[PDB]
Amino acid sequence: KVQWGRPGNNLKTGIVGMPNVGKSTFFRAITKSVLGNPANYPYATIDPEEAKVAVPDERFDWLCEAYKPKSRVPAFLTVFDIAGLTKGASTGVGLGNAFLSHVRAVDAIYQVVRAFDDAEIIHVEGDVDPIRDLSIIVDELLIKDAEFVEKHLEGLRKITSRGANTLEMKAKKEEQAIIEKVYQYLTETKQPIRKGDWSNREVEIINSLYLLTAKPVIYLVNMSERDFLRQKNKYLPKIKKWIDENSPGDTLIPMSVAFEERLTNFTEEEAIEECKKLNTKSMLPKIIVTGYNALNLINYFTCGEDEVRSWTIRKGTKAPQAAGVIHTDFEKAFVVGEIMHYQDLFDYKTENACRAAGKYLTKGKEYVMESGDIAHWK
C-alpha cells in the first residue's frame, strides 16, 4: 500500500552503536558463523567492512532438498561495519559526523544497545547507562536531519520570490510547505521522521532528503552469555520501555555477542546440541531476517537439477523487473513468465504434478511476484 526509503533491491544495513558495545565483536561474529562466513565463494571477495550474510529461509531449505542441485545459492543481507569504515573516534558525545557520513550510505540501522558492565573493575553506579546513550544517538540523528532540512529549506526560500509567479512557483511552494512540516516534526514533535504520519506525496519528498532519521532501526540489546542464557537482564526492562516512549514499533532483539561468538566454534550440528543443552538458540537467524524484512525485501527462486537460487526483490516488484534481476534481457524481451507458487510446488513435490493440476501458472507483465514464487524465464 505504501513504499518508504531508497529505490531498488540492493539495499544494505549498517551496524550503529556507542563506543564499546560489541560492535566489532558482533561483526566479526557474523562474518565467522555459517551465515556470514565467506563460504559463499562467487569470488566476490567482499570488502573487509562488508559482510554478505545468508538469509535463512526454510523454503530455500526444502527446495534445495527437493531438487538437490549441484549448487545452492541463498539470498543475502548486506551488513556494514560502520565503525570499521572510520578508525576515528568522534570527539563529540555521540557518534560523530564521520561515523554518520557512512551511515547515510546505508538503508537500515542495527543499533547495538549495551546491557552489560563486565568492563568495570570498580563500580561508580551511573557509569554504564544504556538509557542515556539510547537517547544520545536519537538526538544526534534528529539534529543532523534538522540541520539538513533547515539548510535545504533555506535553499527553497530563495526561488520563491513573487512577480509572474503562481504559474509554476506554487508547485515548488507546496514542497516548501511540506519540508516545513518535516522540520516542524524533527524539531517540535522531536521524533524520527520515519514515525510521522505522512502521505504518499510527503513520503516521496522526504525520500529525496535521504534523512538519517528515515531509515528503520533494529535494536540489538547485547548482554552477557550468563544473562542471555537465563532470559533475564539488569537493564532489559528499562531499555524496553524507553523504546516504547521514544521509538515505538522498532524491533528489540535481546542477544549476547559473547554467546553468538562462542557458537561459531561449533559445527552446525554441535551448535544445536549445545543450544539444546543450554536450552536456547542463536539469534543471528532472527536478526538477519528482521533486517531483510525491515528493508521491505522478499524473494523468489529459480530451481533446477543444476542450481537452486533465491533472488532478492522488492515487496511489490512485478514479474518483468523480477526477471530483470537475473539477466537484463529477461525484462526487455519479456512477454510472459512461468510461475509456480511455493505452496503448490511444496504440495506436489514436482513440477509435473502441479503442472498437471494446472498449478504451473503463466504470468505476464502485470504480475506482482509472490514471496517464495518459483519462476522460470525463457
**Which residues are paired to 340 by β-bridges?**
374
Q: Alpha helix (H) ranges present in the chain? A: 23-32, 58-67, 97-103, 130-158, 169-184, 200-207, 225-228, 236-244, 257-263, 268-277, 284-294, 319-324, 328-332, 342-348, 351-356
Tell me the resolution in Å.
2.8
Q: Same structural domain for residues 245 and 101?
A: yes
Read off the CATH number of the domain in which 150 is found.
1.10.150.300
Q: Same structural domain for residues 242 and 98?
A: yes
Binding site feature residues for ATP: 20-25, 223
Closest to 53 (Cα-Cα) out of 231, 217, 285: 285
Q: Same structural domain for residues 15 and 157?
A: no
Q: Same structural domain for residues 364 and 316?
A: yes
Read off the CATH number of the domain in which 68 is found.
3.10.20.30
Q: Same structural domain for residues 167 and 152?
A: yes
Tally Cβ neighbours within 10 Å of residue 193.
Answer: 25
Q: Same structural domain for residues 118 and 231?
A: yes
- Structural domains in the chain (count): 3
- The x, y and z cell numbers of residue 45, run together, are 571477495
The β-bridge relationship of strands 50-55 and 336-340 is unpaired
Q: Same structural domain for residues 197 and 273?
A: no
Query: Method of determination?
Result: X-ray
**Which residues are paired to 109 by β-bridges?**
14, 217
Question: Which residues have CB under 8 Å from 98's CB, separation 6+?
Answer: 86, 88, 90
Q: Same structural domain for residues 115 and 129?
A: no
What domain range includes position 195? Answer: 125-215
Binding site feature residues for Mg(2+): 24, 45
Binding site feature residues: 20-25, 45, 223
Q: Same structural domain for residues 139 and 2?
A: no
The count of C-alpha atoms lying within 13 angstroms of the C-alpha of 316, restricted to the half-sphere facing its C-beta, is 5
